Amino acid sequence: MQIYEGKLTAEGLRFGIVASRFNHALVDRLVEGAIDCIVRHGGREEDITLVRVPGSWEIPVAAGELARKEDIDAVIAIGVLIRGATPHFDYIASEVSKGLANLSLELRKPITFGVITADTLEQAIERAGTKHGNKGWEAALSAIEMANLFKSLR
């Protein structure tokens, strides 16, 4: 059987991170997690490109620009959506998720999903470096794996 997989060592890999500013007190923790994951897996900080955008809504168009760069192996999308009183959250979460997924397929390049989509503030805090881990770290680890996989698969 032919088996393809990615290892978790990040030597030589180059990453794009797109991180929104809305809910920054939590997003900033996700960004810290993503960078730490990359660096301590052997990636060089110099080989990270960080792009900041206003909100989750704006993540896809920026991710599209980064993913198109030949010298970017994978893009990590980072943001924090917390449900408000209206369905605004639903429409933004739907389109941010659809956009990133679509871009990944269109550009044949891994784009990982470190966007929290929480019903409550407590849930967001849980997932931004507390009791349920750090979604930035998780999305980064995924990107490492995917970039390594793609070195043979793509």
Ligand X SMILES: O=c1[nH]c(=O)c2[nH]c(=O)c(=O)n(C[C@H](O)[C@H](O)[C@H](O)CO)c2[nH]1
Catalog residues that contact ligand X under the rule CB under 6 A: 20, 22-23, 54-58, 79-82, 84, 88-89, 92, 112-113, 138-139, 142
Residue 51, marked binder: no
Task: Select 38 or 92, whichever has its Cβ closest to ligand X.
Answer: 92
What distance lies between CA 147 and its chain's CA centroid?
A: 13
Task: Select 73 or 138, whichever has its Cβ closest to ligand X.
Answer: 138
Binding to a copy of itself in span 61-120, by CB under 8 A: 61-62, 64-66, 80, 82, 84-88, 91-99, 101-105, 108-113, 116-119
Q: Which of 24, 41, 88, 132 is catalytic?
A: 88
Q: Which of 34, 141, 147, 151 binds a copy of itself (CB under 8 A)?
A: 141
What distance lies between CA 65 and its chain's CA centroid?
A: 14
End-to-end CA distance of the chain: 19
| β-bridge mates for residue 125, sequence order | none
Yes or no: say if 118 and 124 are a contact pair by the CB < 8 Å rule.
yes
Residue 8 binds a copy of itself, judged by CB under 8 A? yes
| Residue of 89, 117, 144 whose CA lies nearest to 26 | 117
| Minimum distance of a copy of itself from residue 131's CB (angstroms) | 5
Our answer to whether residue 24 is catalytic in this structure is no
79, interface contact from ligand X, a copy of itself, none, CB < 5-8 Å by kind: ligand X
Are β-strands 48-53 and 15-20 bridged in parallel, bridged antiparallel, or unpaired?
Answer: parallel
What distance lies between CA 88 and its chain's CA centroid?
A: 22
